[PDB]
Amino acid sequence: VLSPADKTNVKAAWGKVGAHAGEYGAEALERMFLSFPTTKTYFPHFDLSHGSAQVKGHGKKVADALTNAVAHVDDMPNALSALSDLHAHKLRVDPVNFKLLSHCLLVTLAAHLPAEFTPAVHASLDKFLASVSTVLTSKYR
Amino acid sequence: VLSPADKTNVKAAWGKVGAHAGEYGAEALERMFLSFPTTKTYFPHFDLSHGSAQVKGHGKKVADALTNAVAHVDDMPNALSALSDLHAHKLRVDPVNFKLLSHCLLVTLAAHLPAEFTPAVHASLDKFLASVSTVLTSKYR
Amino acid sequence: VHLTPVEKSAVTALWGKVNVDEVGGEALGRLLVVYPWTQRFFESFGDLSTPDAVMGNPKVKAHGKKVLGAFSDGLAHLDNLKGTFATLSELHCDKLHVDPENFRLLGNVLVCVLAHHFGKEFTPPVQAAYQKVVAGVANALAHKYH
Amino acid sequence: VHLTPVEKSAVTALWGKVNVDEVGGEALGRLLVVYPWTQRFFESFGDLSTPDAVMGNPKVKAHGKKVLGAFSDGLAHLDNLKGTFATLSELHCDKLHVDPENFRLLGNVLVCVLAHHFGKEFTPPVQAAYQKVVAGVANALAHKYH
Numbered sequence: 338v339l340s341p342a343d344k345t346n347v348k349a350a351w352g353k354v355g356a357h358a359g360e361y362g363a364e365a366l367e368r369m370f371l372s373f374p375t376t377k378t379y380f381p382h383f384d385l386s387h388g389s390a391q392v393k394g395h396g397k398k399v400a401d402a403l404t405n406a407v408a409h410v411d412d413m414p415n416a417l418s419a420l421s422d423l424h425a426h427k428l429r430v431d432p433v434n435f436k437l438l439s440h441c442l443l444v445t446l447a448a449h450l451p452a453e454f455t456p457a458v459h460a461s462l463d464k465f466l467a468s469v470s471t472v473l474t475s476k477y478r
Numbered sequence: 479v480l481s482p483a484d485k486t487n488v489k490a491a492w493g494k495v496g497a498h499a500g501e502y503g504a505e506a507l508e509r510m511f512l513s514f515p516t517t518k519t520y521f522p523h524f525d526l527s528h529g530s531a532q533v534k535g536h537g538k539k540v541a542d543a544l545t546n547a548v549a550h551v552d553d554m555p556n557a558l559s560a561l562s563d564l565h566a567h568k569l570r571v572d573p574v575n576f577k578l579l580s581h582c583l584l585v586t587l588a589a590h591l592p593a594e595f596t597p598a599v600h601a602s603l604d605k606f607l608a609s610v611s612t613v614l615t616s617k618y619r
Numbered sequence: 620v621h622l623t624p625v626e627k628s629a630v631t632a633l634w635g636k637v638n639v640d641e642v643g644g645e646a647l648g649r650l651l652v653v654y655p656w657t658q659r660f661f662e663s664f665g666d667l668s669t670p671d672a673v674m675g676n677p678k679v680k681a682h683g684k685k686v687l688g689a690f691s692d693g694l695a696h697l698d699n700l701k702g703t704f705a706t707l708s709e710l711h712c713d714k715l716h717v718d719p720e721n722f723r724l725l726g727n728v729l730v731c732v733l734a735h736h737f738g739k740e741f742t743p744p745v746q747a748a749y750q751k752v753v754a755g756v757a758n759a760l761a762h763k764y765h
Numbered sequence: 766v767h768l769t770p771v772e773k774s775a776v777t778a779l780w781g782k783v784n785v786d787e788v789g790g791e792a793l794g795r796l797l798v799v800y801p802w803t804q805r806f807f808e809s810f811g812d813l814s815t816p817d818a819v820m821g822n823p824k825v826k827a828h829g830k831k832v833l834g835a836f837s838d839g840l841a842h843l844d845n846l847k848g849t850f851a852t853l854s855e856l857h858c859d860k861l862h863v864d865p866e867n868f869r870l871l872g873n874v875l876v877c878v879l880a881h882h883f884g885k886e887f888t889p890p891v892q893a894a895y896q897k898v899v900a901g902v903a904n905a906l907a908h909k910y911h
């Protein structure tokens with residue numbers, strides 16, 4: 338459950354991401370795949386080589402979904418229903434994997450936007466990503 | 479995120495608890511304290527002896543809080559703000575302990591209401607208790 | 620934590636009354652229903668699309684029996700769970716890469732099933748003893764990660 | 766934990782550049798801020814009421830240095846983390862009863878701090894090597910639970 342301050346922190350931090358959202362999404366995926374190789378099992382059909390255009394394209398999709406989540410922070414179940422269907426109903430992704438990607442997203446943001454990555458913002462972002470994770474791994478429809 | 483079917487299951491199953499609410503709440507606590515002794519460290523100001531009046535009374539408070547949570551299932555953060563104040567801000571309860579109590583609650587319900595504890599109802603109750611747990615361990619004011 | 624002798628007698632006495640054809644299947648089925656991502660490890664098992672479909676699936680019932688047998692092996696070798704589950708640890712960790720949290724979940728589902736079957740006979744002290752068993756088993760199964 | 770020769774050289778090179786007076790304190794501080802229940806274990810440390818209070822708290826900084834030193838000991842003894850952290854595990858597990866998920870959390874906060882300090886130098890392969898390391902440390906601290 339995000340506080341009003343959490344929502345402001347997330348929105349402020351995501352604003353500074355700007356045109357680099359896809360780049361960061363791609364880097365987080367790459368960090369996940371290298372650090373936690375078991376996660377590659379969900380993408381057997383993907384080119385996962387370093388610099389893969391497919392991973393870059395997917396990073397953009399993931400980033401765009403998070404952007405949409407930021408826009409609908411008080412309405413996430415409704416906004417993300419199709420992504421819940423994909424991840425929870427069809428893919429049946431183990432929730433641990435969301436913790437791994439979420440961690441890799443924090444690592445990416447800390448690496449790129451250090452002035453933005455305060456302890457307060459780190460905490461809000463962790464909660465936001467946990468919230469998105471909960472929605473994508475629940476079957477509620 | 480609870481589905482409509484989840485909410486109907488929880489309303490139905492918890493509705494069958496009735497006058498046994500405190501009894502079941504007390505039993506779940508007793509089960510938790512015996513099975514997971516580290517949980518007792520949160521209650522140094524309680525008489526935790528078996529058949530303690532304070533535990534029976536607290537079991538009622540726990541169970542009555544759940545009834546409140548079920549009653550306000552679509553607005554749990556608002557409805558349970560005082561309890562989040564208590565468990566997240568004041569007591570700083572490690573979320574693992576909520577997983578432990580929730581499990582013990584399911585065990586109690588399974589033992590006492592076996593006809594009601596279908597695989598689907600089990601699923602919905604586990605999600606409900608996880609949802610309550612998230613609210614009580616989050617700081618969102 | 621070690622079981623006490625009184626606890627070891629209590630768990631063994633209750634386990635003798637367990638329906639060996641059924642309880643394993645109910646635990647596995649409930650895992651697949653309550654924690655649906657676990658279905659990913661059982662794609663060859665057929666229809667898992669509804670609770671009824673899962674619970675009435677013959678491959679779930681059959682495989683549950685095997686799961687139950689392994690728990691039976693643990694109860695007969697509580698002083699050596701590492702040794703007993705060494706082979707199963709390799710299969711689940713090295714080959715299948717099952718996240719260890721899921722071993723904990725299945726243990727607790729089994730406990731819920733025992734409560735479901737035994738009712739007030741599944742007393743708080745009896746549960747406490749079984750929590751030690753299922754924790755020991757989960758830990759033994761995750762040994763290859765340690 | 767097993768690192769390849771290049772991973773070992775990569776982790777060592779980065780670690781030599783670590784600010785030993787700050788990085789531990791920022792990791793512990795962020796743990797207390799991001800996962801606020803962990804504050805329960807530090808009642809004697811005084812003001813932890815806001816993020817600024819936590820990060821600026823002298824005892825958090827001091828204790829952070831000790832935590833960082835433990836990670837250094839671990840890096841020096843990657844072949845024997847279980848032995849190295851034996852007494853620390855007894856403390857954290859048998860005395861303090863810290864749930865072991867929190868060990869994983871602190872390892873990952875440390876990794877976030879390393880990213881925060883080193884920026885683009887904390888590359889994905891470098892992170893991967895460090896994830897092996899912090900997982901090994903977490904596992905070693907939790908050994909008393911195994």
Ligand code: HEM
Binds near residue numbers: 379420434
């Ligand atoms: C914050 C977390 C996540 C977000 C926002 C997210 C978002 C998305 C989006 C937007 C898509 C594309 C849907 C479309 O095609 O229109 C997708 C697909 C997918 N996601 Fe995720 N995802 C997340 C976490 C995960 C994790 C943790 C895994 C696995 C470890 C995963 C595995 C997949 C897979 C396998 C696909 C399908 C790829 C394909 O076949 O094209 N996702 N995700």
Ligand code: HEM
Binds near residue numbers: 521
């Ligand atoms: C479903 C989960 C839970 C519910 C619904 C719940 C509900 C409650 C309620 C209603 C109270 C009484 C507050 C009052 O005085 O008005 C309370 C108090 C308390 N709860 Fe919980 N609780 C839950 C889980 C936990 C867990 C897991 C722990 C610790 C392991 C915990 C520790 C406490 C403590 C220490 C109090 C002390 C109240 C006092 O100061 O006397 N609770 N809880």
Ligand code: HEM
Binds near residue numbers: 690710715
């Ligand atoms: C926690 C206690 C568990 C026990 C005692 C247990 C026991 C077993 C046993 C005895 C087998 C048969 C191996 C053989 O015949 O060679 C097996 C296979 C398997 N287990 Fe488990 N298991 C446990 C947990 C899990 C969990 C949590 C998952 C997945 C989430 C899992 C997935 C599997 C799979 C996929 C197989 C192979 C099925 C096949 O051959 O098609 N197990 N398990």
Ligand code: HEM
Binds near residue numbers: 807831857868
């Ligand atoms: C994951 C890696 C961790 C490492 C390497 C680590 C290391 C240490 C070290 C070196 C000490 C000093 C002990 C002594 O002086 O003998 C210590 C103390 C302590 N650690 Fe940790 N620790 C870790 C995780 C945790 C976590 C997750 C918590 C709590 C959530 C925790 C709570 C404590 C506490 C309470 C003390 C005692 C502080 C006091 O004396 O008041 N530690 N730790």
Ligand SMILES: *Cc1c(O)cccc1OCc1cccnc1-c1ccnn1C(C)C
Binds near residue numbers: 608
């Ligand atoms: C609030 C929250 C935190 O702090 C951590 C993880 C997940 C969280 O919420 C998940 C979420 C998000 C959006 C809508 N509903 C939910 C949800 C799922 C289960 N309970 N809840 C709460 C009732 C919000």
